[PDB]
Each structure stands twice: as C-alpha cells, then as structure tokens.
Design a protein around this ligand. Structure first.
Ligand SMILES: CC(C)CCC[C@@H](C)[C@H]1CC[C@H]2[C@@H]3CC=C4C[C@@H](O)CC[C@]4(C)[C@H]3CC[C@]12C
Ligand SMILES: CC(C)CCC[C@@H](C)[C@H]1CC[C@H]2[C@@H]3CC=C4C[C@@H](O)CC[C@]4(C)[C@H]3CC[C@]12C
Ligand SMILES: OC[C@H]1O[C@H](O[C@H]2[C@H](O)[C@@H](O)[C@H](O)O[C@@H]2CO)[C@H](O)[C@@H](O)[C@@H]1O
Ligand SMILES: COC(=O)[C@H]1[C@@H](OC(=O)c2ccccc2)C[C@@H]2CC[C@H]1N2C
Ligand SMILES: [Cl-]
Ligand code: NA
Ligand code: NA
Lengths: 532, 215, 214
C-alpha cells in the first residue's frame, strides 16, 4: 500500500510549474506572437489550449494520482496490452537527457564568463572574430555576440558536420558536470529534497523576470517593441499555418508523454484535487510565456530604436535569442554586468527544474517496475548520470551543437506525438471514459464535465493528428544554416524516434504470446485493468 | 562594342546629396530602358530605379522614394541618378545596367562607381615595413593602418613582381581602415636586392614608398 | 516586395562534378521573367541564364536551368575552374525588382598546411606611439583557420584584426592576416610575442615566436 508523499501541497505545484516552464517559454512563444499577427495569435492559442492542451495535461495528472505508480506500471495496470506506452514514454525522456542538459551548461558557461565589467561579446576586434563581424545583427553580416557564441564558446567553426565532432571542450565538460552534480544532489533523495529545491528553480526566474521587465520597459523605444509583439492582425486567423503553430506550441509547452506529469502526480494524496492543480499550473505556464514576451520585445524594441537594427534580424527563436540577440543588448545599457548574471542564471534555473522532472519520470517508473532499484536509489542515478555525462561529452565537443540539434528534432519529435495519441485512445476507448470519470469522481468528489469527456475521446486525437499530419506534409531533411545533414544522420535519428514508438506494437505482440486462449479471450484479458 | 561607364560617387556625409552619371556607347541609347542597381559591401545586389526608353515611365524600388530622382538625357547618351538625404545604408557600388526586355533581364553592365556615406572624416594612411627575425625562402610584408576611406592601392617594387603576393582586404575599425600585404621570395634575392612597398590613397593624397631594412 | 532566397550561400566543389543551386521565391514568378547572373570576384555581374531556360551569349553548354512558380534551379553539367563565382537569380515579373541572396561557388582541393610568419612592429611605428604585431598565414585549405595570440605566457584577445582573402585563381587555397595592435608602453612592459594556427591539417598548432631581447 504505502508510498511516500509530498512534504507539502505547494511543493508538488512548483515542481510541476518548474518542469513545464522552460526556455521554450521564453524563446518560442514571443516569436510566435510577432510572426503570427500579435495579440490576434492569442485567439487560436487560447482555443487550442482549451480543447487540445489542457485536457491532455489534465489526463496525465489525473492518471498519475489515481494509479499511484510510475509510468511503466501505470499503463501496465491500466491497459496491460498497451503497457508498451509505459516503456516508450520513459525512454523518450531517456533520450532527451542526452541533449537538453547542454543548454543549461551553456547558461552557466555564459554566467561564468559574465564576471567582468567589460563583456567579451561586445567587440569585433577580438581573436575569434572575422571580417564579416558587425557590432549588431545585420543582413549578410555577423553580430559580435554571434561570433562569440560560435567561434569561441562553441568552437563550432572547427567542425564541418556531425561526422566531425572535433576536440572536446573541457570548460564545457566542467559546466556539464556541475549541472549533473546539481541534478544529482537535488534528485538524490526522493521528493522530500528535490521537491524543496524547486522553490528556487521555479520561483527565481519570476524574480529575475520582474526586474528585467522593469528594466525592459524603461528603455527608450521599449513601447515600440510591445507593438511588434501584440499588435493584432486577424488575417492570420484564416491562415491554417497559424492554427498549426498555436496547436504545436500549446501541446509542447505543457508536456504529456514524458511520464513526468504521470510520475509527479503519483506522489499526491488520492483525494487531493488534481483538477484545480491542472488548471492553476496550465494558466501559470501560459501566463509566464506571455509575461516573458514583454521582457524580450521591450529590449528588442530598444535595439530597433537606439541601436538602429531591423526588427526582422533581432526577432528570433531557439537558443539564438538568449545566447546572442538578448545579451548583445544587455551590454549596451548601464549596469550591464548585473543584468547579464541574473539573465544567464535565470536561463539555468529555467532548465534545471525541467530536467528534474524528465529524470524523475525515469527513476520513478523504473523504481516501481524493479523493486531492487528503489533500494540504493543513488547507485542507480549515479550510474545513470555517469552514462549521461560520459555520452554528454559528445555535446561538449566542437561539433556539439550539430549533435544537439539532431536529438532536438528527432528524439522529442513525432515519437511523443504518436505516444500521447495512443495515451488518449487507450484511456478514452479501450479503458473507457466511463471508468476514467468514475475514478476522478472518487478522488476529487465530482466527475469531469461533459466538456472534458468530449475533448479526451474526440477533440484530442484529432488535435494531435492535425499536428502530426501537417508536420509530415511540412517535412524537410534536417539542416542547420548552410549545413545539410547526411542521409545516414537522418536515418539514425528516425531509429531514435522509432525505438520509442516500436515499443507499442512490440510489448503488445510479446504480451499476446505469453497469454492463454484464442485471440478473443486473451485480448479481453489484456484490456482488463488491475482493479479486477 | 557596348560600353557603360559610371562617373561621380565618393564620400558623402549623412543628409548630403550627390549625382551619378552613366556614359553609354555602342548602341542607340534612346531605344533601351536603363536601370540603376547598387551592390552593398555584403555582396548583395539591390535594384534601385528603372527609367524607360523615352523616360516617361519611372519605377522606384524603395528604401529610396523621393530621395532619389532618376534622369535621362538621350541627346548626349547619359544616364543620371540624383540623390538626396543619403545615409549609411545607401553605401554601395552603384551599377549602370541596361535592358529593354523584361523577359531577357539585364544584358549589359557597367564597371560601377563607389559611393560611401559616413560621418567619418578622411585620414592619411601610415604605412609600415615588416622586418623578419634573425631559410629556403623569406616572407616580407607591408602594413597600412589607420586610413579612410577605401580604396588604396598597394604594389611591390613599383608593381613589377606579381607572383607570391597576397594582398589582404581592408577591415574597418573605429572609423579607420587597416590593410596588409605579404610577398614571399627566395633568400637569394634578399637581402640581395632592394625591396620596396608602394602604397597610394588618392582621397588623402598620400603616396608613400618604404625601404626594407633587416635592422 | 517578392523576396528571393538562394541556397546554398557558399558551396564547395571539385572540377567535373555536378552542381545545383536553388532559387526559391515568396511569391509565384512567371517562368519567362526569371534570370540568372554570374559575378566574378572584383568584376561586374554578367547575364548568364534568362527566362529560366535559355543561356546568354558566350555561356558554355555545361550550364542549364529549370523551374516554375516559387521554385527554380541553376545546374552546371561539369564544373570547371573558370566557373568559380557568385551566382544571383532575379525576377522581372513585378516591381519592385529583386535579386536572390546569391550563391557563392568555390573550388575544393587538397588540404594544405599554412605557412606562418611573425613580424615585429617596425620602429618607425613605435615613434608614433603605437605598436602592432603582424602574423601572416598563407597558402592553406580549407578557408577557416584560427590564430591565437599568446604573449608569453598569457593569451591576449582584444586588439586583433583578422583578414582572410578571397579564394585564389590558381592554388585554390586561402590566406589570413592577424594583426595584434598595442601601444608603445604595453609593448615594452612585456616579454615576447607568439601567434600560432589551429588547422584541420594538424591537431597540433603551427607556432611562431620572437623575443625582443634577441
Ligand atoms: C491567454 C493566456 C494569457 C491565459 C490562458 C487562458 C486560459 C487559462 C483560459 C482561456 C480559455 C479558458 C477555458 C475556457 C473553457 C473552459 C471550459 C470550462 O468547462 C472549464 C474551464 C475552461 C477549460 C477554461 C479554462 C481556462 C482557459 C483555458
Ligand atoms: C514577475 C511577476 C510579473 C509574476 C510573479 C509570479 C509569482 C508572483 C507567482 C507565479 C506562480 C505563483 C505560485 C504558484 C504556486 C503556488 C502554490 C499555492 O498553493 C500558493 C501560491 C504559490 C506559491 C504561487 C505564489 C505566487 C507565484 C509565485
Ligand atoms: O569574460 C571571460 C573572462 O575570462 C576569460 O578567460 C576564459 C578562459 O577560458 C579561462 O580563463 C576561464 O575558463 O575563464 C574564461 C571562460 O570564458 C578571458 O580572460 C576574458 O575574456 C575574461 O576576463
Ligand atoms: C525536450 O522536451 C521538453 O523540453 C519538454 C520538458 O522537458 C523534458 O521533458 C525533459 C526530459 C528529459 C530531460 C530534460 C527535459 C520541459 C518543458 C515542458 C515540456 C517541454 N518543455 C517545454
Ligand atoms: Cl507557452
Ligand atoms: Na523549466
Ligand atoms: Na512550457
């Protein structure tokens, strides 16, 4: 019966808040508003959030709290045929850990290089620069902040592709180690410790965002950036691509299918209200990105005014925004050293809490499956983080970014789309919504409304299929800058993307072979829950 | 047969005005539409203005409206481009290009004239020799530092020896250009003989010749 | 305006191999109104391919092109050294007229180690109050090379002006010039100078040093 529980109610929430809110909040959402017509983009965003994202977010949190056990066992007890979902969901998170942590390493690497009052990325006269360098972003040229991030920090110019990784940056390897050391000691003991640590990692960004919002809006031309941000264009509502970006962002911003929400909620009390938790968490996540947009664009508008740079050049997504564009502006304004330290520390704290969840989803799921793992929990995560750090050295190479960009697209790619798709179908059809509503009623006291039941069985599979289809329509071979990945690199990634998905039919097929009977009895044997 | 040359152009302060002219020969000039195309230092072509054969049809691609006025004189066969309110982003090499037929594009281009728009002021280059240190062959070079604006001309021994000479392009730093050139030659010549670096920056009227001393 | 995007911006090729550069538009362009140009280094552009198909005057038969709508391509049958240049596509379909971002073609060759030489500041310069050390790196491939100024035994960053050269018409290698600029006094307080190159040719850098007391 007994399993440990959170040491507080707030600890669970901030743990989920932290996991959900990451660099993608800062570096993708604000760009989507600018690109898709501003404040008008909130309309498809809100709708897709309402019908697509939150019901799926609600589902995992509900499933986790009810079955009270990790990802693999949860789907094992729910639909024994589909237990492979529990395997796919875990090793997806296992793949992400090989790359995602290198972003935090960059943040610390910048944070460490941020002790000085003359910032190294301001000037074009340094040793790592080239004639194409310009003080700020320009068409056809390279910014000083750019050449610092590539030719110095990453040393990416040493590499011709993914076939050549080059030497190993040991300043990066040190930064990566520190990250895992922080992760190890936080995640070491159960939620009695890691649950407390998130009080920093989750809250501290809001502290920095506050003082960066004040600093941002006070800059000359800050109001100009806000217009580039929220100025409504409703012509984009008719555009199908906008509905795809809104649907994709909503789905990825709150992650289902890493088993994290499933694991995190599994430590909640049975009669805890997980419906209010899902609503509170989802809102804060969306609210964070909205606020973060003001921070970015007030500074982006400051650049387009006083620094005389095109808004098209400085408006960007991905790591390029926070590691190049944004620090370039910081250096220009007074007390630059202060804004630099809190920003790169914020980036680090934005990465850590997320990494906590992803790893915890692996630990908890393997702890409930294999009893021997719960004993000597650290012996497991030491060997786990060792394997991560050893392979993580490849991310610390000169061709490290080429490796990072590969796993970013594939590991976390369509793998998780078809995984969550089978999650909704298994629950709402195979397991049934009647059972799911009955379970939720027994927990929070009341059953889900008619709205939530329709979304789960009908809207959500369409919602995910709508994204998956237009993702494949819009498929191109993986490329970065002018470098096109070799066809064996794309193939390797699809295996990484497929090694998860393949768990669904495999574990299903392997289970049928171990059951007695003709096809008709054994499949009702495998669709029978653990509560019978 | 067909020849297009571009006159005018040079250093102009922001807000200033300048007029470019294009001399045409080898064809009937009144029968073809002319167009100004400028090339930015980033090596990226941008169309500016088109004028018809009779000059009754004018098209402006605009970062440029109302600042530029394209003109045509079919009597003397000259193409004019009048500029005003110039700023830094107007800095480029302006080409005089022709074509009448939109379906065939621009079939003939001129040599081009260079326009530099900056608040920076003209300075004279200080050129320096580079002495090697106390082999089958020896490398020697000439450093040209702190000048504006481009361009300068660098030759070795009054522009006699070609081979083994690498002239590096100028790089702008703090409104000042720095340039260098390397020449490799056998140690049988040097110091068998006298090597001389020849630098010319017409804008600043500074023409300098440097002798190389191993000391 | 209709923006033309060319891929790829820089392309390396061995003579005799096929090459294809693509030109894509934001708006659909009439197949008759698209044109191509070749611009040699330090020279004026020249009409190369007009109306997506027909070659211009003087253009060898090795060149070809195809496309329609928002997608067009230029193809050279078998590349010769004479074909090294930057290629710009163009649309006349509607004003304002526009050019592609451009595709720069460069020749590939055997990897060559650089020849590094270090030059102390000429005393004629020291009288002016400045001191600048120059490091020449000549005849190497590929284009990207990295210089390190370590004045012994610490490395200095700022005050360094690097300049490459366009790809050459015969060796098909490159050359780079690193200039470390200081004042008179900072040159005096310190000991010796050194610039060396990390290249693909060798995992071990090529070092050049001279000391003021020798
Ligand atoms: C736009 C940003 C800043 C705020 C995010 C808006 C979110 C929090 C809002 C917008 C639309 C809202 C939803 C509208 C419809 C319903 C159906 C109702 O039976 C339960 C609440 C629920 C599910 C709302 C939850 C909160 C909601 C999703
Ligand atoms: C920087 C400005 C604009 C926004 C600041 C956001 C802060 C104030 C918000 C965002 C998330 C919020 C927290 C979310 C979780 C909980 C759990 C709840 O049981 C107590 C309140 C508490 C602890 C909230 C306190 C206030 C909070 C920290
Ligand atoms: O802004 C960075 C400051 O330290 C730099 O040195 C590097 C170098 O890798 C090593 O000394 C250590 O790892 O610290 C930094 C990491 O970038 C330079 O000394 C200067 O750029 C700055 O003082
Ligand atoms: C790479 O996948 C993610 O970034 C997700 C998540 O990250 C992970 O799932 C994860 C898994 C393993 C290691 C690190 C992160 C954090 C936030 C919430 C969803 C999404 N992200 C926006
Ligand atoms: Cl978001
Ligand atoms: Na996070
Ligand atoms: Na998020």
């Amino acid at each position: 019966d007994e399993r440990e529980t959170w040491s507080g109610k707030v600890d669970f929430l901030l743990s989920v808040i932290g996991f959900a809110v990451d660099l993608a909040n800062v570096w993708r959402f604000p760009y989507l508003c600018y690109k898709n017509g501003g404040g008008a983009f909130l309309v498809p965003y809100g709708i897709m959030l309402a019908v697509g994202g939150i019901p799926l977010f609600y589902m995992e949190l509900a499933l986790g709290q009810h079955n009270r056990k990790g990802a693999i066992t949860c789907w094992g007890r729910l639909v024994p045929l589909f237990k492979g979902i529990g395997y796919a969901v875990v090793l997806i998170a296992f793949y992400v850990g090989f790359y995602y942590n290198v972003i935090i390493a960059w943040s610390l690497r910048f944070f460490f290089a941020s002790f000085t009052n003359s910032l190294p990325w301001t000037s074009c006269n340094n040793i790592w620069n080239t004639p194409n360098c310009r003080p700020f972003e320009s068409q056809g040229f390279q910014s000083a902040a750019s050449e610092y991030f590539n030719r110095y920090i990453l040393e990416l110019n040493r590499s011709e592709g993914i076939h050549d990784l080059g030497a190993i940056k040991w300043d990066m390897a040190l930064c990566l180690l520190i990250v895992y050391l922080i992760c190890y000691f936080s995640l070491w003991k159960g939620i009695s410790t890691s649950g407390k640590v998130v009080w920093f990692t989750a809250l501290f960004p809001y502290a920095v965002l506050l003082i960066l919002l004040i600093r941002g809006l006070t800059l000359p031309g800050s109001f100009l950036g806000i217009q580039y941000y929220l100025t409504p264009n409703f012509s984009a509502i008719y555009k199908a691509e906008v509905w795809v970006d809104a649907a994709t962002q909503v789905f990825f911003s709150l992650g289902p299918g890493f088993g994290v929400l499933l694991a995190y909620a599994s430590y909640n009390k049975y009669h805890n209200n997980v419906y209010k938790d899902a609503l509170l968490t989802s809102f804060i996540n969306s609210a964070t990105s909205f606020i973060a947009g003001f921070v970015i664009f007030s500074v982006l508008g400051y650049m387009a005014h006083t620094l005389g740079v095109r808004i098209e050049d400085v408006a960007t997504e991905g790591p390029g925004l926070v590691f190049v564009v944004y620090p370039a502006a910081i250096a220009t304004m007074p007390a630059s050293t202060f804004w630099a330290l809190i920003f790169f520390m914020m980036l680090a704290t934005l990465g850590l809490d997320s990494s906590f969840g992803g790893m915890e989803a692996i630990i908890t799921a393997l702890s409930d499956e294999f009893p021997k793992i719960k004993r000597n929990r650290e012996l497991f995560v030491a060997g786990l983080f060792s394997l991560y750090f050893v392979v993580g050295l490849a991310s610390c190479t000169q061709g490290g970014f080429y490796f990072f960009h590969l796993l970013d697209r594939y590991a976390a790619g369509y793998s998780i789309l078809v995984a969550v798709f089978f999650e909704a179908i298994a629950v709402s059809w195979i397991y049934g919504t009647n059972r799911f509503s009955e379970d939720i009623r027994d927990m929070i006291g009341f059953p889900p409304g008619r709205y939530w039941q329709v979304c789960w069985r009908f809207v959500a599979p369409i919602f995910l299929l709508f994204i998956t289809v237009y993702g494949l329509i819009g498929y191109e071979p993986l490329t970065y800058a002018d470098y096109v990945y070799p066809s064996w690199a794309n193939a390797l990634g699809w295996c990484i993307a497929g090694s998860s998905v393949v768990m669904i039919p495999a574990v299903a097929i392997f289970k049928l072979l171990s059951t007695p009977g003709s096809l008709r009895q054994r499949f009702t044997i495998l669709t029978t829950p653990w509560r019978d | 047969e067909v020849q297009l040359v571009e006159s005018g152009g040079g250093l102009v302060k922001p807000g200033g005005s300048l007029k470019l002219s294009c001399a045409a020969s080898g064809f009937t000039f009144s029968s073809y539409a002319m167009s100004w195309v400028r090339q930015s230092p980033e090596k990226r072509l941008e169309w500016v203005a088109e004028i018809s054969s009779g000059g009754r049809y004018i098209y402006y691609s605009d970062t440029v409206t109302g600042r530029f006025t394209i003109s045509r004189d079919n009597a003397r066969n000259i193409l004019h481009l009048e500029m005003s309110s110039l700023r830094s982003e107007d800095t480029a090499m302006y080409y005089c290009a022709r074509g009448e037929v939109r379906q065939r594009g621009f079939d003939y281009w001129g040599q081009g004239t260079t326009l530099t728009v900056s608040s920076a002021k003209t300075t004279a280059p200080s050129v320096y020799p580079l002495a090697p240190v106390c082999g089958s062959s020896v490398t020697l070079g000439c450093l040209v530092k702190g000048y504006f604006p481009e361009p300068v001309t660098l030759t070795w021994n009054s522009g006699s020896l070609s081979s083994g000479v690498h002239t590096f392009p100028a790089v702008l730093q703090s409104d000042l250009y720095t340039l260098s050139s390397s020449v490799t030659v056998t140690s049988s010549t040097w110091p068998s003989q006298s090597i001389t670096c020849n630098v010319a920056h017409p804008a600043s009227s500074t023409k300098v010749d440097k002798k190389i001393e191993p000391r | 305006e209709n923006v033309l995007t060319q891929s790829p911006a820089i392309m390396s090729t061995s003579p005799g191999e096929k090459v294809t550069m693509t030109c894509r538009a934001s708006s659909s362009v009439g197949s008759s109104y698209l044109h191509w140009y070749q611009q040699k280094s330090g020279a004026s552009p020249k009409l190369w391919i007009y109306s997506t198909s027909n070659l211009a005057s003087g253009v060898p038969a090795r060149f070809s092109g195809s496309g329609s709508g928002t997608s067009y391509s230029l193809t050279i049958s078998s590349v010769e050294a004479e074909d090294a240049a930057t290629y710009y596509c163009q649309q006349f379909s509607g004003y304002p007229l526009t050019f592609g971002s451009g595709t720069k073609l460069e020749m590939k060759r055997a990897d060559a180690a650089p020849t590094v030489s270090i030059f102390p500041p000429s005393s004629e310069q020291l009288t002016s109050g400045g001191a600048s050390v120059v490091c020449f790196l000549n005849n190497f491939y590929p284009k990207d090379i990295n210089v390190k100024w370590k004045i012994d035994g610490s490395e200095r960053q700022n005050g360094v002006l690097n300049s490459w050269t366009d790809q050459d018409s015969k060796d098909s290698t490159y050359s780079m010039s690193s200039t470390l600029t200081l004042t008179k006094d900072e040159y005096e307080r310190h000991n010796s100078y050194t610039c060396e190159a990390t290249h693909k040719t060798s995992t071990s850098p090529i070092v050049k040093s001279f000391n003021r007391n020798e």
